[PDB]
Every structure is written in C-alpha cells, then in structure tokens.
Design a protein around this nucleic acid. Structure first.
Lengths: 50, 180, 262
RNA sequence: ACUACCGAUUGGAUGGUUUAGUGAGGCCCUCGGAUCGGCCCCGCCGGGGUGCCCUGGCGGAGCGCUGAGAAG
RNA sequence: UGGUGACUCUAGAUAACCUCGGGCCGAUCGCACGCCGGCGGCGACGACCCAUUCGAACGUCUGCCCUAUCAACUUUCGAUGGUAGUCGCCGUGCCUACCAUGGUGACCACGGGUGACGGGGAAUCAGGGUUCGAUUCCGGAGAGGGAGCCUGAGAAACGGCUACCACAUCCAAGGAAGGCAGCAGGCGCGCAAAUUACCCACUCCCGACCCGGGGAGGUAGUGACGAAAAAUAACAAUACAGGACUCUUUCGAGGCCCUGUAAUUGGAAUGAGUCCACUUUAAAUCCUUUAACGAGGAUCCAUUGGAGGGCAAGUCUGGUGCCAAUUCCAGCUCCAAUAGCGUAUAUUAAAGUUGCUGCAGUUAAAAAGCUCGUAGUUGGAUCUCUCUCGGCCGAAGCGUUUACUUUGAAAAAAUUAGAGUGUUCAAAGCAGGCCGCCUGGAUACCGCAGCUAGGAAUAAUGGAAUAGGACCGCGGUUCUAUUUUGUUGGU
RNA sequence: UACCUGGUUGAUCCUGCCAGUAGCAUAUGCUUGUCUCAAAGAUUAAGCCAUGCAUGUCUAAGUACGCACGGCCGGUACAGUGAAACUGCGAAUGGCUCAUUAAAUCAGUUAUGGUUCCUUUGGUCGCUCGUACUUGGAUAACUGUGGUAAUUCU
C-alpha cells in the first residue's frame, strides 16, 4: 500500500512536470527566447551567433 | 574495483576539554621551547607517547615468560633505544611508563639542528631545514619532524649544495654582487 | 551466477602467491588442471613474481610460447597453467630445474634441483579402483591414472614415478615411522616422522608427526604426504628442512646473520 | 480573511486478497500435408560377356512404394 | 578381484535388449622426410566412457530486528505421513492415485512491519555493551512489471527471443522499432553527488589466437568527503625594558653576559610564482631534478568563530528610540584553533537517564486491600575401570547420561593488533640491502555451534524396600551349532 | 586519562532532565598558498532516458578460382598475402544496483553412499568375428534482376 501510494504521487508529479516542460519551445507553445549577452570586449559576438 | 588502498589513520587526538588553563599553558610552553607551528604537533607527539604507554601497559599485564610479552616488549624497547628516547641500560618495560613528551620532542631534526650549532636558534633551525640547507648522511631533508636515530646523530651534515655548505651562493648574493 | 567464473580478484587470490594490493584488481586465475585453484602456483606468477625473468605478463607469454618451459617433461604454453606440489619445472635453455615444494611458512619455495633429480617425481595415491575386464587403476594427487599398479600400493601411499614414461618405479607405504611433509592446514610445510595415526570412522583421521627437533604436531590424514622411507627423504629438501622456527629464534638467526656479515 | 477536521456524491481513477467466467503466447501430444527428393515403368539412346542383364545424361505419366517437410 | 565405518559399491558370469527424433569403434589438417608396392616421426582438430579440475544444485546442525492493538494456524485448492508411480540431472508431496489424520504453537507458531539484502567489517572503548554496514571482498537477488521459452555444458539470459500490463520512438497511416539498477551525459527528484575526455602501455579476461578485442580495467578532468606532510619569515648591529654575575654597605660602574620589544638600520637565505631542458608516460600532466627571472608595508597583506551572566576571554566607543536606566545598528579590545573554522540534523560517548556488569520505588517517577492460588525461576546437609583374541601392550563393553572446563584438528583475503624495512619524514607501501650476491613478503585474534581427547570440584539425573536385587555354581524348557561323522543319504 | 562546566531556591542539599563538551556521518556557510593519498546520484524516484561507446574472435595446422594484390614454369590442382562468407568458440565472465527477501538470504559445520559438469589434465580409442588409393546432395560469399516511406528487412 505504501509502495502504491508513492507510485501514485510520483506519477502525478511527473505528469505535471512533463506538461510544464513541453509547453515551452515546442509545437504547441511560443518559441524559446534566448538573449545572448557578451560580458567582455574581446568577445566576438558574431562568431558566437554563427 | 580500483587498484587503490583506502587505509589511513589520524595521527593525533583533540583534547577532551577544550579550555583548561593548565593544559593550554603546558602546550604553549612546549610550542615555544621547541619552535613548533601549532598545537597539533604537540597533540601528535602526545598521541604517539600515549600509544606507546598503552602498548607497555598491555604487555605488562602478561606473565613474565609469555613469548609474546618477551618478543613485543623486546621489539618496543629496541625501537625506543634506537630513536634515542630510552637509554640502552634501561631496556625494561617499567621505564617506558616514565617517558615524557620532551624526549620525543628533543629527538626531532629541528631540535638536533639547533643543538649541534648549525643554527643560531630553534626557529632558525626550522627555516634552515625547510629551505634545503640540511642533509642527514647523504639525503636532503625538509621535514622538521624527522626523528633522528642514534646512528644518524653523528651524520647530520650540511647540504653540499647549500650556500653556507658547498659554497655556491644564493639569489641575494649573486644579485647584489652584480650591481658593482 | 549463471555459469562458471573466469576471473580472480587480487585480494581474493591465495595468500601464499605473495601478490600485492596495488598492481591491479585482478590476479592470474589458474586454469583447470591437475591441481586445485587454492593449492597451486600458476606459471605466470612463477616466471614473473618469483623467478623474475619477466617484468610483465606479456613477457611471460613471450617466454612461454617460445616453447622453453616444461612441466613434468611436457611443454606447456598456457601462462596460467596450475602447477602444484612436487611438480618439476624444467627450463632447458637456461639449464634450470625446480620442484614446487613448500617453505616452512607454507609458500612454494624456489627450490633448485639436480638434472638427474628432475627425471622423477613423487605422487600421493588418492584412490584405487578396479575397472573393466578386471584392470586395477590408481589415481594420484595430480590427476594421474596408472593402470596395473603393484597390488601392495594402497591409498595414502606414495609412488615414485618416472616422468619420461609415466610408470610406477618405486613406492612407499603409509606406516608409523616414515617421513612425511604436511601439505595443508596450519602446519603447511613442516616435515617429520609419523608417530601415531588415530582413526575416527565416519570422520577425518588425525596423524601425529614428530619434527627432527622433537616438536610434535598433528594434522588430518588428507594433509600428509609421505616423502621418504623411515628417515631419509627421497627428494631434495629446501634450505629449511621442515623445521619451523618460532619468531624468537628466527629473530635471533636474523640478528646473527646481520652480525656475521656487516 | 486564514488554519485545521467531517462529508452526501455506487463521484472518477488505482492497487491487493479473493468468488465466478474469459484468456494471449510458448511448450508437449494427435492430426494435417503446401512443397521438395529417391525407387519402380516407359521413351531418346552409348558397351560388354555373345536379343539375358546392367553402365550414364535428359524427359513422360502413374494419391504405386516411400523419405524430408512449412502454414494451420 | 579390489574397497568403505557402512552398498543394492567396483569388478565377474549367464539370458537377452540396444530406441530410425539412432552410442562408440577418425572418409579431417600442417611440417620433415626416411627405410625395405609395403612399413614410419612430430603435432593440430574431434571423440562414447572413466578420473581430475572449475563449479553448480539439492540436503544436516546452530545462529537474526520490532510487534499480542496478530493466540491459534495448516488441512476441500497437499496441510503431516505411507504404498505405487509420473516428472525431474538426481533425493523428495515435486506432482498424481488410494489410504492414515496427521504437522506447528505462550521455548511466541501463524500474521504483520522494518526508514531490513546477509556477512567479512566500521565508530566508540577499562569492561560489558551501543550505533552503523546502499558502498569496491565473499554469497544472494534483479534488469520497467509479470509470465513463457529457444540455443547451449551452463540462462528461465534481457547490451537473446515471444506475449500481456505500463510507458514510449518513427510513419507516406499500410507498417516498423523499444528497455542506461554498464561508461559518460541529460531531465526529474531533492539538503544531497564529477567529464557526452585519452588508452589497451599496466592488471587480467575472451577468441581459431605470441598478432585481434575489452567504458573490465588503466590514465588524466572535476573533487576543502576524508586522511598525511607542511610556507606565510629568520638573523646581525643599534636604542630602550628586564634578569643573572664581578666590584661597592648602598646609590651605582659594568666595550660582563643573557633574554625581550622595535613608526631603527643591514644584506644574507629561500620558496610561492613565471618559465628552457630533462625525467615521467601508451601519449601527456603532476611530482622529483635542473638552467633563467623571482621578497620589505618581504601590499607575495590568514581566516573562522566567540567573549562585557558560569569553562578562554571587557571597569571600552559612537549613533538611534522609551520612561539615569533602557530597543536597534556600527566599531575598538581580548580569547580560541589555524589552511582551516562555524552551522543544522542524526548518532555515539560523557550516562550508572534502560543499569548483565550496574539504577531505582517512606517523604521526589514508582509496591498490588488481604489470603489462597498453574507454569517458569530458585532450592539445606550428606557418598574417597575391566573382560576376551593377536604382538608389558593393541582391538572390545565402557564408567548412568549430561551441563561445565581444557586440549587437538579444522577454520578467505582485506581490515584490526603487531614483526621487519630512512616512502627525504609521515599517512602509506611491501618492499629492499651489499659489492652478480644476500634477503623478506612474519605472527596474533578469528564469538557461537559442530568434530577430538582428557578432567570429575560444582548442579541436575538414575541404579535393591509388594524384592520377579546382585555373585556363583546345579540345572530343566524352547529356539539356536556352520562345523571335529575321508566323498556322501543322516533319524 | 574510567575528567568535567552551568541551569529550579531568599539562601543549603537532593531527585531529575536539559544546555555546553568530545567522536562519527551527511549537508551547508565563510575562507583557502604548497605537496601526497583519496570518497564521490546510495538515502528522495528498482523514477524516466536524446546521443556515442560498453563483445568479439585466425593459426604452419577447417573451407580461398574476390587479380584485392602478387613470383613462377609454363599441361606442373593448390606459391604467398588476403576483404567477404560458411564453419568453430565466446557472448551464462565482467560491470551496475539493493527493489525484493525474516530460518528465507547469509555465516560457520557437515553430506552427495542422492546428482550434473564445456574446458584442462591423465587413462581408454586393431579388446566387436560382421568407392575405401576417398562417397552424396546442397548452400553462402561472388554474378545478375528486384520490392517497400522505413530496419543489422529480404
């Protein structure tokens, strides 16, 4: 009974986390927006973007 | 499955009560007299002496003609005589219970470099050993806690490459003599 | 497991091989052969650890499969071939011969022998049975079957056998007053004369053996290998003659040897 | 407004003992016989002991005799 | 014939059988070639069986935490036993048929739980104990959950297959593929844990194999888990402050010493670093070894905590509010340990607060109204070796049986204790040492239970009192001698 | 080293528990020059897994007509090296984890006189009274034609 109860709780939490991770960056959600910031002057930003 | 050993031991014990004035004063006395870096070196030598006293009491519980008592007492006495802590005529397990921490401190390399006049002080002796100015019979030793045997007592020599020894001078003396 | 094992961990190896802890996680794992796993010295440990012709196992393989090593007169190129008690190792290139017999501390001594002594070996008889068409067979301690033995040869007796041919040449009975060497238990490596064998039916017999210095020790009947008839061994013995010195006299002998030389 | 309990809804789902029933898939047994080959018969025919026989390659039909054998 | 402690053992003889899904009795491959067409030496590969090795698999005895808010359980559906078989590699209720009604339990069964894989082991340590052991060695179990197979000597195998259950990948929608509790790596979970690196050089393993392969394993990377060693300054002159000693009653003098403190001077010594070259190594890194540069505020700058209530350590300062005391904040001074030091949680020791050693119960936690009253626990004194066969001895009955005690055998390593050994010392390691030689790789402990041989105090136990009790001989009845009736029938 | 300090009362003593103290574990905070060893996704999820790798293998000695190369000597079947493929062996070891599991596992002790065992090692291998100077049919690799979106499909 303890094993099955823990199984139920784990299945609930994993389903919720799966919905949360699939909404972002997938085909049913908005694109994943990445902001690239170079923190130093010697950094070649165009090379990073290529 | 690794081809590694995990055997190791701690070489000291902390005191049971942290702040007792008599123990603190006695430890500070031995630190100052022997030029030691911290309390842990006093605790290390105290641990070695306590282990030797425990072995002596354990062998003293045995009857006189026990082969293990004779063998292990003879080996322990031979080791204590070999590092100069006991005298050769006092090879008896009862005298081990009269040994003090100060004999083990005097058999260090720092103390022997001080007492043989190679150093002007005990702290000069420590910084001399630490800076590769001391050799024991052939071998340059950095370790102040190198316990000297009676056969190596007369071979503490002075490092055939050291500026004060073999003769080739140090960094300051070549830099300063290059000015003029 | 689901089947037989092929690996021997180094700390789980037999202690008398004298392997160390940090060279690897594995030990050489003796092949199946005429000796038990726990009572043999594999050929790689002999040629590398003891005799030091080789520095690695690859050099052991290069030595062995140039066909230089004979065990009991037969060329072996298995580097883990289990060699054990009374086995003759012959290296014809360097002209060396050995018998694997025990030290007084229970370890296989490097015992060099004469090339005429390498012609034969001794075996302890472990079973006598009659096979088909009334043909008597004996089985020795090294998995040798000999047909038509002497009718006087019994179990626990020792045959003196010729390695050129493999036939029975001489034998020694198990009797009170014969010389024996202990090949198992706590008294491994000791040599003495049998003085009393007490019998326990349905159990193990206990043989009492007396040393040449007058010390007495008992073993099981399985641990007794009869070597010589009465008092004179039929093979060469190591530097110690089966005389186990205690730690005190061993320290005294070490100190006298250090005093005499140095 | 917050914290903490009861709770009609057989609320919906899930699991573990069980009553009754169904039961995939393998294994074994009894059948089955798609296909594949040999013998016999005959045809095209080479030689001998001198038309009796057999020698070797190809084809023809015969639920004749059989052997291997898949699905089911 | 030969064997065991004991065989329905091994070997022998007879009568046959010997499976078509079939048991052996060699249509195999290399190298050197030689003697009188015939005779041959090394091997390699196969091979029924027997033994051995490596095992495995079933049994024996003893040993495990909590729970009675689990007291009766097992038994139709095998529970305990018998007989015959089936199946199985074999022993067996393993299964089937017919029988018997049995088997276990307050000495705790059956049931349930465990934040339970078991041991070797670890922390503590006067001793007894208490806590920990997922984890590198040994044994077991499992590969998402169940179940069933094939092949093979060996698997109920999952880096094999076949289903179902739960998930889940591709798709042209017909179909196809799946199993990181391997090495890395990711997500999730969380207080909580490393690189999608190089190599078979070492250790070993596998294969037809000296040659190929191995995320086993080795080597680097991350790594203040933890353990060892060990810098962050030393000295000289000068100036003050003390303490000795000579000379003076003293004050005082000491180119008399010693020891400290320096907003005082002085060059000597070095690592940390930077960086050739070797060495290292599979290739490298590191370490070691060495050139060169490299130290005065040697700024090349040691931290973490605590103190003005008790163990170490405060008659301190300034802001900010309440009615001089008094909330909050920032400092100074001191103490401790030190490349380390605080905090939380759990646990152990202090702890004799779980008490066997070894606690308590008038008045502080706590002894029952009183008597009778199963089991269990506990119980006064007493009791001082032999007979047969074989060479003074060996076999045999033991003497009531124990409990107790001792001995002997047997009993993985690692770890622990401990012997030897200048890893530069040490934690380590198993090495090394001497001018080819000489050595090591000890030893102890290893509860309990079980084998072995002694001991006889202590504590149970039994041996004759209705005598159908010993020790002798005389016996009577019944069964019974394996041989002394040459070969035999024998009442 | 068989050690202690403090907390209830106006004050004294006591029972008693608590806090400090020391070790072991995990975590975390701040700090951190050198060097030697060295644990390291167990605890919660035996939860779920993108990608790559983790098990393959040839000697003189099973099968070589792949010119893929390569010298003869020439009727000399086959020099020799050797991809592929058939055949043999191994893949049941190793590695991981600790979910299960409470006389079960496991430990010590005994037994197989109650069984199997590739391999190694030794024995046995004219012990049978009844085309051989060598037997038969295929099937890979290779050549050639293909199917499916898709596979270590065929």
């Amino acid at each position: 009974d303890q094993r099955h109860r823990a199984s139920q709780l784990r299945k609930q939490k994993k389903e919720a986390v799966l919905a949360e991770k699939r909404q972002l960056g997938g085909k049913d959600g908005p694109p994943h927006q990445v902001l690239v910031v170079p923190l130093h002057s010697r950094i070649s930003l165009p090379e990073a973007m290529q | 499955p690794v081809a590694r050993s995990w055997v190791c031991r701690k070489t000291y014990v902390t005191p049971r009560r942290p702040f007792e004035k008599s123990r603190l004063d006695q430890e500070l006395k031995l630190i100052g007299e022997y030029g030691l870096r911290n309390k842990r070196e006093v605790w290390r030598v105290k641990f070695t002496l306590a282990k030797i006293r425990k072995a002596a009491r354990e062998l003293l519980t045995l009857d006189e003609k026990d082969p293990r008592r004779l063998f292990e007492g003879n080996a322990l006495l031979r080791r204590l005589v070999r590092i100069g802590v006991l005298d050769e005529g006092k090879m008896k397990l009862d005298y081990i219970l009269g040994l003090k921490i100060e004999d083990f401190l005097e058999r260090r390399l720092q103390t022997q470099v001080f007492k043989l006049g190679l150093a002007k002080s005990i702290h000069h002796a420590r910084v001399l050993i630490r800076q590769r100015h001391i050799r024991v019979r052939k071998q340059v030793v950095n370790i102040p806690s190198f316990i000297v045997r009676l056969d190596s007592q007369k071979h503490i020599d002075f490092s055939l490459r050291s500026p004060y020894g073999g003769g080739r001078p140090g960094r300051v003396k070549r830099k300063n003599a290059k000015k003029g | 497991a689901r089947g037989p094992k092929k690996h021997l961990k180094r700390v789980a190896a037999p202690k008398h091989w004298m392997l160390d802890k940090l060279t690897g996680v594995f030990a050489p794992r003796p092949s199946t052969g005429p000796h038990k796993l726990r009572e043999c010295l594999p050929l790689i440990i002999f040629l590398r650890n003891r005799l030091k012709y080789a520095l690695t196992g690859d050099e052991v393989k290069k030595i062995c499969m140039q066909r230089f090593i004979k065990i009991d007169g037969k060329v072996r190129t298995d580097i883990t071939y289990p060699a054990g008690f009374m086995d003759v190792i012959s290296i014809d290139k360097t002209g060396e011969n050995f018998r694997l017999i025990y030290d007084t501390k229970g370890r296989f001594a490097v015992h060099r022998i004469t090339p005429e002594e390498a012609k034969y070996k001794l075996c302890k008889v472990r079973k006598i049975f009659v096979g088909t068409k009334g043909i008597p067979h004996l089985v020795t301690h090294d998995a040798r079957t000999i047909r038509y033995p002497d009718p006087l040869i019994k179990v626990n007796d020792t045959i003196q056998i010729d390695l050129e041919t493999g036939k029975i040449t001489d034998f020694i009975k198990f009797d009170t007053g014969n010389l024996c060497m202990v090949t198992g238990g706590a008294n491994l490596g000791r040599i003495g004369v049998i003085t009393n064998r007490e019998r326990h039916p349905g159990s193990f017999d206990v043989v009492h053996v007396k040393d040449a210095n007058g010390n007495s020790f008992a073993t099981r009947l399985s641990n007794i290998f009869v070597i010589g008839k009465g008092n004179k061994p039929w093979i060469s013995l190591p530097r110690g003659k089966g005389i186990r010195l205690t730690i005190a006299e061993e320290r005294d002998k070490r100190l006298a040897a250090k005093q005499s030389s140095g």
